[PDB]
Amino acid sequence: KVRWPDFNQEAYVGGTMVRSGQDPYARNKFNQVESDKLRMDRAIPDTRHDQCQRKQWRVDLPATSVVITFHNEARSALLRTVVSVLKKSPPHLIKEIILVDDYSNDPEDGALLGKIEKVRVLRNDRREGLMRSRVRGADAAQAKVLTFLDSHCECNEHWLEPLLERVAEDRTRVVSPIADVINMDNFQYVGASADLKGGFDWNLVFKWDYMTPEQRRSRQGNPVAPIKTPMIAGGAFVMDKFYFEELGKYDMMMDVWGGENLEISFRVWQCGGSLEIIPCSRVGHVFRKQHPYTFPGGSGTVFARNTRRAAEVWMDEYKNFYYAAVPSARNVPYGNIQSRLELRKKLSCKPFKWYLENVYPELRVPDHQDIAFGALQQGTNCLDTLGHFADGVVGVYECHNAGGNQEWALTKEKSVKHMDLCLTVVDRAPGSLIKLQGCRENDSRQKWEQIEGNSKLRHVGSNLCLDSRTAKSGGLSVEVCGPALSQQWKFTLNL
Amino acid sequence: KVRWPDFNQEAYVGGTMQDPYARNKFNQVESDKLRMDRAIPDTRHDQCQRKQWRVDLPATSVVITFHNEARSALLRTVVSVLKKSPPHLIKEIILVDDYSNDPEDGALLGKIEKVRVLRNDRREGLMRSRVRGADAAQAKVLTFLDSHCECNEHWLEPLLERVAEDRTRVVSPIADVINMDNFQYVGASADLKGGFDWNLVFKWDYMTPEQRRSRQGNPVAPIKTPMIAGGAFVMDKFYFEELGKYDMMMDVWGGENLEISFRVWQCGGSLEIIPCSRVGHVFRKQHPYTFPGGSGTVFARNTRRAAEVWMDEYKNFYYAAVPSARNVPYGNIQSRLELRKKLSCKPFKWYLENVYPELRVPDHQDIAFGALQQGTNCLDTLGHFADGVVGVYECHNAGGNQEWALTKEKSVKHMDLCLTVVDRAPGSLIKLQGCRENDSRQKWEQIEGNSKLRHVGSNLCLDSRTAKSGGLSVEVCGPALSQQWKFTLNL
Ligand SMILES: C#CCCCC(=O)N[C@H]1[C@@H](OP(=O)(O)OP(=O)(O)OC[C@H]2O[C@@H](n3ccc(=O)[nH]c3=O)[C@H](O)[C@@H]2O)O[C@H](CO)[C@H](O)[C@@H]1O
Ligand SMILES: C#CCCCC(=O)N[C@H]1[C@@H](OP(=O)(O)OP(=O)(O)OC[C@H]2O[C@@H](n3ccc(=O)[nH]c3=O)[C@H](O)[C@@H]2O)O[C@H](CO)[C@H](O)[C@@H]1O
Ligand SMILES: [Mn+2]
Ligand SMILES: [Mn+2]
């Protein structure tokens, strides 16, 4: 009902500001004062590669229903999101902007924006949470393509076209922009790396992977090409509406936050679709350290519930490596999964083993016969080879959870092995250094056992325990197996 | 004449037997203590202990070269390649005494079955000495070995089988480790390939995750290595001769392994590590012999001679890493350059892209490259992405989080993220941001003779004063010591 530039920022974000001498980081866990300071149509730097910036972008594309979901968002941030969509998108490609107010304390936060050009507002009468709220918006979407966005984003130049171009060509692609960084303190728009893919460790937390050398090198002469990501971050993405609904939408019994990104990423890949990051599509996002909103069941409890619900449906037996990494999770009940499990069989979906081998080989999987795996931790320090080969001393170095020269397995043969070099007891005398040797299934000197409730690591057939007191003066040793803190070793993944 | 078991170990080792490390830079006492036919553990994979090895293979002339070797070690080598190789596959053992102080060291072994001794009139060095032995070889196939090695069970067959199938293969065993102090025979990793950094010193690369996955099926298969260590290898004799043998004007040590490795690959052959061939070797810390030329100088001479012939333009990245090498003269190379054209031979860019892709290579419009060193510490990203603080962390010389370039666009870049001066006030933290060729805040210059790193259009220099507290800062810029930065490669 109003052209967006004629909308009044100052009247909106007006009372709802930050009174004198209050906490600026109060309601949203980002600096609201700095957010409020900025204009709705603020200038941001074009963070795209030269290759993108300078390409007649296709505009004969199917239009999209943009779904933004929010609970207690900062008016400034919400507005800036909405306007950035309208300002930077070709107008014919925006069918509508659906705002799903997920039970925000003041309905006026969302309601007032309903004045704006193509903005509809849908209020949740109770608290539904991120996933359910997104599904509502998608069901209310008129367009043939869905675009999701977090409520504190800022679309960049020609952001939408490259996303649509992908989905229009192939409906099975679920496509995400590069997530530029909006600083939570100063609110500066910072350009992010285009050399990353999304991923995870066995704890099933999202993390950004560096692109492998083999991959980068294959993309050297096509730097702005699509990136095939094993996981989407989950905040900003575009998906064909019919594909979204056919492929099961979201797990409706997930709550608040967390899990859904994992779940959908697995699902899409496993059931014949693909996931991509598009470097020419840039969308800023306010990344933050704490959650500002309430979690009904406890923060970490609900996260585990959702994560479980995903793992239990899609991961097959490899779900155990998650439970191995996060034993605590086994206690959290996750309810019924029959619908989502049948969905899987209904869709004739591939197994997780497929996903691991073809989509995310990079992810280190322990052998079915391994006893433990990962890093061997002692406080902050972790068991490091220090680049040593055969006949080498082994050491400790601060942990960097990247499994480089700090990755170890504890085998069925009872050996502590890195690659095919295994910890070997050269000399049984107390104080003697241990050496890295080639793995023999029978050497006897490289057989180890975990004792004192998986806290220690004892040399088998002996009274001797691995000991780090000698690191700074030679390397790790065997010493007489007693109550030292230097003899304490815990594996990252325990089976 | 005399069979090896009837040879008198005691009495040979006898006139030799007081610092153990002063003689050979390994524990001579422990070496001397051991039997010539010492027991060593079978360090091969199980999937090799059950292999009917084809034994209708060509024989080899084994070339062992030495200058002041330990008698115990030399003998043990010779006997190991007699005991552990099938007799019909050993045509002869050629011992090239490279002007050793007592000629009796080599001469006395002439008594042993299949052993021939050649004394070098003058000091030649390892490459020239090897060429002599190869020219004196009968046999269709050459095997080279260092004079302090110990062949393992069925070591030779897998090497020959490869060369017999395809004469262009140059094959090396996996090099088990003989302890310099203990003299214990220790089994080595089968998950390594040979390689190098831009300083052109040999190093072992841990073979990639991508590779390790592909070799699940047949784990003891040949390894295509971009470099051979250069000590133990087997090569068809005619192929050795045809492909130019060794760069004859190389001296005592070093270079030859690089030179031949490049040559073989570049001129249409292949280099392999064969995991079921196990040969032990006494690895050492410093060289026990003397260098005519002053050690570091001769290494540089040889290395240059190789680089200047085979590396094309990329020789500069070597000179960037080792600036001192641009002087100390490499002499005439016209023959070896002619050799290259004579063979046709592919360019180094080919080698880098097809044989050793994993080698991190700077863009030729970079200004500096490598890590950014301050003391033991290097410039580390600390896993931080865009909008992150950058820091210092002790240098692990292994890449990744500590890889940096200084571009023609004047920017200090890691991956596609560049160092950014967000705030010009002294003491301000610098943040890592996406690289834009037009942001003046992402621009540096190197000043005060490549020692400092100054933010361009400013009075401000990269500084580690704050590094420990939060992150690295941009600082007031003057006589600090925290502002000192050496890039490993400059150009
Ligand atoms: C570009 C760009 C954006 C990329 C950022 C990104 O991937 N964010 C994901 C990341 O989000 P996050 O920033 O930590 O969480 P955030 O507080 O932004 O919550 C997601 C959105 O849903 C809203 N929300 C949240 C919780 C809730 O109960 N109800 C809501 O309506 C909230 O207002 C916000 O707009 O992980 C989530 C896990 O479920 C989702 O997958 C998010 O999409
Ligand atoms: C199996 C197995 C072991 C393989 C180990 C290996 O590759 N060793 C190499 C490694 O050797 P190193 O142990 O550092 O050197 P080392 O002192 O053993 O010299 C190599 C050989 O040359 C001999 N030599 C040396 C100096 C000399 O003037 N004359 C010689 O004949 C020496 O006695 C020995 O037989 O690098 C060398 C660089 O030129 C060669 O490439 C060696 O072959
Ligand atoms: Mn968010
Ligand atoms: Mn040697």
Q: What are the domain boundaries of chain B?
A: 1-359, 360-491
Largest CA distance in chain A: 85
Q: Rounded to the nearest 5 degrees, what angle is found at the Cα of B159, between the Cα atoms of B158 and B165?
A: 90
Handedness of CA B283, B288, B292, B298 (dihedral sign): positive
CA A140, distance to chain mean position in Å, is 28
Contact B464, B482 (CB under 8 A): yes
Relative to beta strand A145-150, strand A64-70 is: parallel
Residue type, A160: L
Residue that is written with structure tokens 């001479």 in the block: B301
Experimental method: X-ray
How far is the CA of B300 from the CAs of A33, B252, B253, B266, B304, in angstroms? Answer: 62, 12, 10, 22, 6
For residue A480, list its beta bridge partners. A464
Give the nearest ligand 1 atom to A256 CA: 28
Does B2 reach chain A within 8 Å, measured CB to CB? no
Closest by CA to A268, choosing from A246, A290, A252, is: A246
Q: Which CATH architecture has domain A1-363?
A: Alpha-Beta Complex (3.90)
Write out chain B residues lying below 8 Å of A425, CB-based: none
How many Cβ atoms sit within 10 Å of the Cβ of residue B99?
15
Contacts 24+ apart (CB under 8 A), A427-432: A427/A478, A428/A462, A428/A464, A428/A478, A430/A464, A430/A478, A430/A479, A430/A480, A431/A470, A431/A477, A431/A479, A432/A477, A432/A478
DSSP string, B268-322: T-EEEEEEEEEEEEE--SS-SS--TT-THHHHHHHHHHHHHHHSGGGHHHHHHH-
Q: What share of chain A is helix, strand, coil (3-state, %, to 5)?
A: 25, 25, 50
Contact A408, A492 (CB under 8 A): no
Handedness of CA A140, A142, A145, A147 (dihedral sign): negative
How many Cβ atoms sit within 10 Å of the Cβ of residue B406?
25
A331: Cβ contacts below 8 Å, ≥ 6 apart: none
Helix (H) or strand (E) holding A241: helix A241-246
Burial class (CB in 10 A: 0-12, 13-18, 19+), B387: buried
Q: How far apart are CA A276 and CA A298, in angstroms?
A: 33
B272: Cβ contacts below 8 Å, ≥ 6 apart: B162, B169, B170, B171, B172, B222, B223, B224, B225
For residue A231, list its beta bridge partners. A198
Contact A428, A464 (CB under 8 A): yes
Write out chain B residues lying below 8 Å of A363, CB-based: none
Contacts 24+ apart (CB under 8 A), B1-8: B1/B111, B1/B112, B1/B113, B2/B111, B2/B112, B2/B113, B3/B112, B3/B113, B4/B36, B4/B37, B4/B78, B4/B79, B4/B82, B4/B83, B4/B112, B4/B113, B5/B37, B7/B36, B7/B75, B7/B79, B7/B111, B7/B112
Q: What tokens appear for B300 in the block?
A: 């540089």
In the DSSP assignment, the letter for residue B462 is: E
How far is the CA of B402 from the CAs of B1, B202, B418, in angstroms? Answer: 60, 21, 13
Contact between A212 and B210 using a beta-carbon 8 Å cutoff: yes
Smallest CA separation from ligand 1 atom 23, residue: A70
SS3 state at A374: strand
Smallest CA separation from ligand 1 atom 9, residue: A235
Q: How far apart are CA A388 and CA A380, in angstroms?
A: 21
Q: How far apart are CA A40 and CA A36, in angstroms?
A: 9
> CA neighbours within 13 Å on the CB side: how many for A395?
16
B53: Cβ contacts below 8 Å, ≥ 6 apart: B154, B157, B158, B161
> Who lines ligand 2 at CB under 6 A?
B 65-67, 69, 98, 125-126, 129, 146-147, 149, 173, 175, 229-232, 252-254, 256-257, 279, 281, 284, 287, 289
Q: What tokens appear for A117 in the block?
A: 């050009």
SS3 state at B53: coil
Residue type, B487: F
Give the nearest ligand 1 atom to A292 CA: 17
Where helices occur in A394-446 by DSSP H, the ranges are: none
Burial class (CB in 10 A: 0-12, 13-18, 19+), B121: exposed
Smallest CA separation from ligand 1 atom 13, residue: A287
Residue that is written with structure tokens 């107390």 in the block: A430
Ligand 1 pocket test target in A72, A79, A130 with most atoms within 8 Å of CB: A130
Q: How far apart are CA A295 and CA A311, in angstroms?
A: 21
Ligand 1 pocket test target in A124, A148, A150 with most atoms within 8 Å of CB: A150
Q: How far is the CA of B172 from the centre of ligand 2 (A)?
A: 14
Q: How far apart are CA B263 and CA B311, in angstroms?
A: 10
Q: Does B67 belong to an annotated binding site?
A: no
CATH 3.30.70.270 fits B1-359, yes or no: no
Does B387 reach chain A within 8 Å, measured CB to CB? yes
Q: Rounded to the nearest 5 degrees, what angle is found at the Cα of B121, between the Cα atoms of B68 and B128?
A: 75
DSSP string, A155-217: E-TT-HHHHHHHHHH-TTEEEEEEEEEE-TTT--EEPPPSSEEEEE-TT--EEEEEPPHHHHH
Q: How far apart are CA A97 and CA A109, in angstroms?
A: 15
Q: Does B281 belong to an annotated binding site?
A: yes
How far is the CA of B137 from the CAs of A248, A402, B433, in angstroms? Answer: 74, 51, 62
Q: What tokens appear for B86 in the block?
A: 């099938």
Contact between A391 and B177 using a beta-carbon 8 Å cutoff: yes
Contact B151, B143 (CB under 8 A): no
Residue that is written with structure tokens 């990744």 in the block: B400
Going through A203-336 in order, the beta strands assigned E by DSSP cover 206-210, 227-228, 237-240, 274-286
SS3 state at A96: strand
Who among B187, B209, B416 is closest to A437 (CB)?
B187
Contact A90, A155 (CB under 8 A): no
Closest by CA to A233, choosing from A283, A301, A280, is: A283
Ligand 2 pocket test target in B129, B150, B172, B253 with most atoms within 8 Å of CB: B253
Contact between B434 and A191 using a beta-carbon 8 Å cutoff: yes
Contact A17, A36 (CB under 8 A): yes
For residue B194, list its beta bridge partners. B204
